[PDB]
Write a protein that binds this ligand. Structure first.
Ligand SMILES: Nc1ncnc2c1ncn2[C@@H]1O[C@H](COP(=O)(O)OP(=O)(O)OP(O)(O)=S)[C@@H](O)[C@H]1O
Ligand SMILES: Nc1ncnc2c1ncn2[C@@H]1O[C@H](COP(=O)(O)OP(=O)(O)OP(O)(O)=S)[C@@H](O)[C@H]1O
Ligand SMILES: Nc1ncnc2c1ncn2[C@@H]1O[C@H](COP(=O)(O)OP(=O)(O)OP(O)(O)=S)[C@@H](O)[C@H]1O
Lengths: 400, 692, 96, 137, 67
């Protein structure tokens, strides 16, 4: 359906230009291909739902990315060595096979011939592998949120640096592996990835600077439709109910208790919590900047006074919460830790409890019982929302 | 047509370096320029020739240069071969060379690329890349063209390798046989050029703040080797070829094989031919800069109150702190670091180190500077470790040997390396800095490697006092919780307070609100945060002297800056040592570079001293300036035996003084009333005693 | 060379020229010169080989130009190996 | 002398004590505001000057290397800054935007810039000759 | 160790003044064929502002001695 879509796209381009006097002289247009970007096909249920029944379907996935393989080239058209025959030959592949003609060039000056390939002038294509760690929206317990490796092809490449909180819509895939890699024998239990098609950029509104090529034009085409696409649901019966609730006078009281109905008279706590949920607005300055758009609420008091349970309650309320205990956690747990991967010699980030909570609240218990060696990353993240790590391999600042 | 395409490239290029490429004569260099380059090259053993790219553009309206740039790697051998046809004519170096090798290296490209701009579309093309080196590799000889010897014919073959895999002929070109047995390699008749591989990473200026900087590995061949040095920013120039890496397996998967043979797995790697590493010289910097921008500087330097116009325009968001903002403006303008007599070399840089009570906007200065000072770095400190801060030792698989990681200090060279929360940094890492403070260079003897790398790096600090906020009750001695040396090496000190008031806190609150009221971004200071950069990049080059007898002055002054300190009983100062005197020298020099004036005059020393010493009513500075000027005036009238001085005579004396005050006559009427307020205030004060 | 070294002031002219840019500290400059020139070592198969090589420990104090002195020494002497106690890594100082 | 922009004398002292004029200073000041009109505008023309020289190289900055036709504004700007403008003569981002607008305006023949939702995308390069119009400073 | 260089910093009204004069003059003196002659000899004049033996003499001296 994507193929027939691109066909129709090019053809309607042609009809449009034979109706519209001048654009690309009817040919430069027709020469270049056309690709389509269908996004938001119905948000699938994250990882643990992905069925081997939908190996070839259009899945939608959310969740931040962990590591991005450096740009990897990929053969698309060969350029074979100009032999003593002195007429180099170029040819594409159109499959994982690459055929080198035994005979030499146009004249059979060497019918027996050792044709070689010039692997510098040959064209290429960008294939970026992007690991992905889905959001902990539903991960019950026991297992760390899962991971689905991704591949990206030549236009969405580098649209997703490390740490971002992207969303993707792409087709599932399934490929076998080898064990000995000497004999042609493969292994059952295919491995799986996602050949991406479209990437909702960051699901954020920083807009400091760009990352990639044309893709940003897609981002601009994306940001304007904000209302329905971001609310993911809106009806003026829902919106009418909303405005009606807003009209109600006991609102600030009501919604307070409406957070944790099971929680007793200590309402002001509820009030502060509610105000945390709506936290602030992102006032972005061209000079200065990073003014911690949200707030932060400690709460203390006599033991057995609902505090911990209020925390549970909130963490359940918000769609991004990351519960976490104190004294059973370390600075690395609080703020992701970087690793110079020696595989491809790159920067991977791992398991930021704080980074998982990028946007939306976190929770922390026994805050006092936290160690003094810990409870120091807070001194940074809470007031700048960045973590500046500087260890033997790498120095960087990951904003959380 | 591609054969004759490369041949037209040859013709055009031989023609370019044939005729003159430089029109100048009688003022610069002779008309023919690359002929002179060749002549210089012939006498010596340069073995390569650099040529401008602009001139290439100016050769055939860029078309030649455009063609060279877009597709390049196809022409490297083509142009290198075309070069001989020229050089054979004029300089007969090549037959006397017994070898036929010349790295035609380009430079001065018009469009640098951030490393994340690298695609595969740019394959085989020519490109320039800014970045920061790291973890150089030891130079290893690399084969370029080898002599293969037949197994039975034993004939010589000038076989060329392509950095891919062992190449080999197919039939013995000796027509005696057409064998396929493996021709025996020879190392002697085989010209091999050593190359060094360095891991370059993206700098900070181009990466969006908050994102991890991508990297890559680049290879230096030819004489370009050894030109790199861990930490040095560089702007490489060269090809963007791809190297086969059999080590890519698994996770990608689908990747194809050469079957109509084995999977050709690849990875990008820049290959740079020329390296540039830079970052009375005004003879250079000025005429290098075109006459137009000279007007812009001329303005921003001939204005009278620049030194003030600058200092109140370094922290547009921050409110006041005219002490610290000064301390920063002087930071970005280093000293001279000029070495002594061949005996030793002394430091020429400044290290301001704020220490402030809570909510003093001390992290704002940093997270600003590190975003405005070139080649800078921000590290929270306590998260980091001492080893990471100075230099790291790590192993590499290329030669199975230990080597260096640049770290924050070495990749922060010639830029401010700000830091947070010293106190939180346990001494285990506080120690690793000292050598990057006074000795200016780090020295490391680990895992067999002994080395020493110079880190000419300004530093900073923002640690908080011991008890978070520090008791005004307690003293300062048992209040900072840091040893004597690192307390001294900081050639500034700013214990910032935080206290209550009304005529202050109201202003501060209004200011913060106006900030959070985006619409009320009236924050525009006189000088933008950009023209300040160019003005600095100029002023960085003055290296003034103390020729003014301020020298004598300074000596005497230092005396009191020792006397005022009275630790115990004639016991040594906590805060001031002779290093502070050297610091006064540098602060003076830096203020001079600020005002863009050589030969520091005593008033400069005065400002440096008072800045170093710190730790109704109207705007306080204005009142005290009125006081100072008026008291000097009255003292002069005293000495000169002049008769008397009246209030209205003093007001007209200021009429004289501040005419660049400007504004409107209304202002004069207002400033006059202010002057009368001030003089009657002194009267009400006990500064000058009145008569009659 | 001898013509100079045959004077009477050499033992103090050297000191006053031992340090290019230092004020005072003649005593410390003296010890620097002494351990710089070195003494005649003498192997002792009888009891234990005793080296004739001085070993100065400079108990410094902030402000006093001690590191500048030893940097001068690094430059002037013949086999200087400057190494700071930050990157010590005992495996590094001694052989391994 | 050659434009070594030093000022070693102006910082001498409060030498400005000779002119013991009357309220005549108001006289000078009465003209001050007048020049404030020109001066400001003068400074303005300075950018009309300054930016000018910069663009004299920009039509060989994007030209001589970048033949991707759909180039946008943010990307091209962030390319201009951090290009050779990290050498002796820096420049700011929005200033690069001004440079682009000026290039387009002084050459609307090829360079066609039209904005969609945010950021003005720029045209498809066709490599004219330039200084022939650069003389229009 | 055999020798223990005990240095100490002590406030003095005068000795520090002279020392300061010295250090300031130090930072003052720091900063074709005939230009190189006029430069080498001026560096040697600065080598003589610290009146005793010039340096190169002294390093050749220490080499001679230890040999
Ligand atoms: N006002 C209240 N409303 C609702 N539940 C309450 C209230 N007071 C006590 N409880 C219950 O008492 C228990 C106290 O749990 P928590 O107060 O959350 O634990 P905790 O207070 O964090 O314990 P510590 O000592 O403070 S760590 C829970 O079962 C609560 O449901
Ligand atoms: N003088 C000031 N004017 C305006 N805003 C200020 C000022 N001081 C602090 N602020 C604001 O208050 C916040 C706290 O600033 P700082 O005290 O610098 O934070 P900090 O750097 O984390 O301090 P520490 O010592 O590391 S906890 C900042 O986000 C500022 O925007
Ligand atoms: N007589 C002197 N003449 C000139 N400079 C001197 C003199 N005595 C001390 N100094 C200063 O001392 C500085 C170097 O002193 P250092 O020996 O490095 O002190 P320090 O040992 O590094 O301090 P530490 O090690 O942090 S306790 C020089 O840069 C001078 O500024």
């Amino acid at each position: 359906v994507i193929s027939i879509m691109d066909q129709t796209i090019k053809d309607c381009m042609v009809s449009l230009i034979v109706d519209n006097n001048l654009d690309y002289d009817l040919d430069e247009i027709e020469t270049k291909f056309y690709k389509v970007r269908p996004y938001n096909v119905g948000s699938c249920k994250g990882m643990r739902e992905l069925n081997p029944n939908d190996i070839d379907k259009l899945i939608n996935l959310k969740g931040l990315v962990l590591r991005s393989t450096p740009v990897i080239p990929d053969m698309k058209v060969a350029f074979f060595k100009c032999n003593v025959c002195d007429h180099t030959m170029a040819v594409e592949i159109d499959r994982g096979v690459i055929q080198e003609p035994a005979r030499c060039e146009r004249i059979d000056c060497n019918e027996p011939n050792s044709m070689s390939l010039i692997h510098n002038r040959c064209s290429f294509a960008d294939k970026q592998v992007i690991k992905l760690q889905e959001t902990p929206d539903f991960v019950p317990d026991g297992q760390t949120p899962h991971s689905i490796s991704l591949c990206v092809y030549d236009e969405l490449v580098d649209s997703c640096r490390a740490g971002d909180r992207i969303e993707v819509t792409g087709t599932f895939r399934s490929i076998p592996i080898r064990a000995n890699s000497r004999q042609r024998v493969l292994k059952s239990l295919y491995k799986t990835y996602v050949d991406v098609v479209h990437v909702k950029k960051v699901s954020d509104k920083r807009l400091d600077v760009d990352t990639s090529t044309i893709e940003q034009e897609l981002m601009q085409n994306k940001v304007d439709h904000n209302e329905v696409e971001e609310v993911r649901q809106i009806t003026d019966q829902d919106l009418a109910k909303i405005r009606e609730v807003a009209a109600r006078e006991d609102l600030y009281s009501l919604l307070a208790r409406s957070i944790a109905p099971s929680i007793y008279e200590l309402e002001d706590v509820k009030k502060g919590i509610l105000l945390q949920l709506f936290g602030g607005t992102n006032k972005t300055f061209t000079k200065g900047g990073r003014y911690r758009g949200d707030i932060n609420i400690l709460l203390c008091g006599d033991p057995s006074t609902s505090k911990s349970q209020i925390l549970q309650y909130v963490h359940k309320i918000t769609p991004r919460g990351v519960y976490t205990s104190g004294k059973g956690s370390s600075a690395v747990g609080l703020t992701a830790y970087i690793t110079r991967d020696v595989d491809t010699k790159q920067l991977v980030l791992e398991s930021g409890a704080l980074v998982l909570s990028d946007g939306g609240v976190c929770c922390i218990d026994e805050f006092d019982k936290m160690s003094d060696s810990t409870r120091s990353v807070l001194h940074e993240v809470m007031e700048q929302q960045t973590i500046s790590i500087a260890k033997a391999g790498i120095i960087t600042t990951l904003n959380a | 047509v591609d054969d004759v395409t490369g041949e037209k490239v040859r013709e055009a290029f031989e023609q370019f370096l044939e005729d003159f490429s430089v029109q100048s004569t009688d003022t610069g260099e002779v008309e023919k320029v690359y002929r002179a380059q060749i002549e210089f090259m012939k006498i010596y053993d340069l073995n390569t020739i650099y040529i401008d790219y602009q001139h290439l553009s100016m050769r055939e309206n860029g078309a030649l240069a455009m063609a060279i740039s877009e597709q390049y790697y196809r022409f490297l051998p083509f142009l290198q071969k075309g070069l001989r046809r020229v050089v054979r004519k004029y300089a007969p170096e090549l037959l006397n060379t017994s070898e036929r090798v010349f790295q035609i290296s380009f430079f001065n490209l018009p469009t640098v690329h951030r490393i994340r701009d690298i695609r595969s579309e740019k394959i085989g093309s020519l490109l320039s890349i800014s970045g920061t080196v790291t973890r150089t590799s030891e130079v290893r000889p690399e084969l370029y063209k080898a002599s293969f010897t037949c197994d039975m014919c034993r004939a010589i073959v000038d076989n060329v390798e392509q950095s891919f895999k062992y190449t080999e002929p197919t039939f013995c070109p000796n027509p005696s046989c057409e064998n396929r047995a493996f021709w025996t390699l020879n190392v002697t008749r085989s010209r091999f050029l050593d190359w060094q591989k360095v891991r370059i990473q993206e700098n900070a200026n181009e990466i969006p703040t908050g994102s991890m900087p991508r990297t890559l590995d680049v290879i230096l061949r030819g004489d370009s080797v050894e030109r790199a040095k861990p930490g040095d920013r560089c702007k490489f120039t060269g090809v963007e070829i791809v190297v086969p890496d059999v080590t890519q397996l698994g996770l990608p998967g689908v990747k194809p094989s050469s079957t109509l043979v084995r999977d050709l797995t690849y990875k990008i790697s820049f290959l740079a031919c020329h390296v540039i590493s830079i970052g009375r010289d005004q003879e250079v910097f000025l005429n290098s800069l075109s006459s137009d921008e000279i007007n812009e500087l001329k303005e921003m330097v001939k204005d009278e109150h620049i030194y003030d116009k600058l200092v109140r325009s370094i922290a547009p968001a921050v409110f006041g702190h005219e002490a610290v903002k000064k301390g920063i403006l002087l930071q970005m303008l280093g000293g001279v670091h000029k070495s002594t007599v061949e005996g030793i070399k002394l430091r020429g840089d400044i290290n301001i180190c704020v220490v402030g009570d809570p909510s003093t906007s001390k992290s704002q200065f940093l997270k600003y500077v590190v975003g405005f000072a070139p080649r800078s770095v921000y590290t929270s400190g306590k998260a980091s470790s001492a080893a990471g801060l100075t230099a790291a030792v790590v192993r590499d698989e290329e030669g199975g040997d230990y080597t260096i990681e640049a770290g924050a200090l070495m990749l922060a060279d010639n830029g401010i390396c700000c830091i947070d929360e010293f106190d939180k940094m346990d001494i285990s890492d506080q120690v690793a800095i000292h050598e990057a403070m006074e000795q200016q260079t780090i020295s490391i003897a680990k895992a067999g490697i002994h080395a020493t790398l110079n880190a000419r790096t300004s530093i900073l600090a923002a640690a908080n006092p011991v008890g978070g906020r520090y008791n005004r009750k307690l003293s300062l001695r048992g209040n900072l919780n840091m040893t004597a040396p690192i307390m001294s090496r900081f050639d500034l000190f700013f214990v910032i307070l935080d206290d209550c008031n009304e005529k202050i806190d109201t202003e501060l609150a209004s200011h913060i609100v106006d900030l959070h009221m985006k619409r009320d971004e009236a924050i525009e200071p006189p000088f933008s945060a950009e023209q300040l950069r160019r003005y600095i990049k100029y002023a960085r080059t003055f290296k003034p002297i103390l020729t003014k007898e301020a020298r004598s002055y300074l000596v005497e002054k230092y005396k009191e800056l020792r006397k005022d300190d009275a630790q115990g009983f004639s016991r040594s100062s906590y805060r001031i040592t002779v290093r502070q005197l050297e610091s006064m020298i540098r602060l003076s020099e830096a203020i001079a570079r600020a005002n863009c004036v050589d030969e520091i005059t005593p008033s400069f020393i005065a400002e440096a001293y008072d800045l170093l010493r710190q730790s109704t009513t109207v705007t306080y500075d204005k009142y005290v300036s009125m006081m100072n000027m008026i008291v000097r005036k009255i003292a002069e009238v005293d000495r000169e035996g002049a008769e008397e001085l009246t209030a209205v005579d003093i007001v007209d004396w200021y009429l004289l003084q501040k005419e660049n005050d400007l504004g409107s006559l209304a202002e004069y009427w207002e400033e006059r009333r202010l002057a009368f307020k001030v003089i009657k205030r002194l009267v009400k004060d006990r500064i000058l005693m009145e008569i009659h | 060379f001898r013509k100079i070294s045959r004077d009477r002031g050499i033992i103090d002219k050297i000191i006053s020229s031992m340090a290019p840019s230092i004020y005072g500290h003649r005593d410390i400059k003296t010890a620097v010169a002494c351990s710089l020139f070195g003494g005649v070592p003498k192997n002792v198969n009888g009891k234990h080989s005793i080296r004739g090589d001085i070993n100065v420990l400079l108990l410094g104090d902030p402000g006093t130009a001690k590191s500048q002195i030893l940097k001068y020494v690094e430059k002037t002497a013949h086999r200087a190996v400057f190494a700071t106690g930050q990157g010590a890594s005992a495996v590094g100082l001694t052989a391994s | 002398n050659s434009r070594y922009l030093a000022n070693s004398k102006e910082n001498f002292m409060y030498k400005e004590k000779m002119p013991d004029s009357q309220a005549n200073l108001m006289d000078r000041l009465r003209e001050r505001e007048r020049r404030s009109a020109a001066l400001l505008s003068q400074r303005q023309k300075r950018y009309q000057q300054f930016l000018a020289m910069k663009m004299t190289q920009v039509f060989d900055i994007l030209f001589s290397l970048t033949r991707g036709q759909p180039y946008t504004e943010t990307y091209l700007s962030s390319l201009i800054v951090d290009s050779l403008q990290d050498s002796n003569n820096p420049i700011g981002t929005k200033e690069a935007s001004e440079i682009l607008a000026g290039l387009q305006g002084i050459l609307p023949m090829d360079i066609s810039v039209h904005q969609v939702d945010g950021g003005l995308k720029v045209y498809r390069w066709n490599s004219l000759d330039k200084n022939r119009f650069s003389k229009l400073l | 160790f055999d020798i223990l260089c005990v240095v100490r910093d002590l406030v003095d009204e005068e000795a520090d003044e002279r020392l300061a004069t010295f250090v300031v003059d130090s930072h003052v003196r720091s900063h074709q064929l005939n230009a190189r002659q006029r430069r080498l000899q001026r560096q040697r004049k600065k080598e003589e502002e610290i009146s005793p033996i010039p340096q190169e003499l002294l390093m050749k001296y220490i080499h001679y001695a230890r040999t």
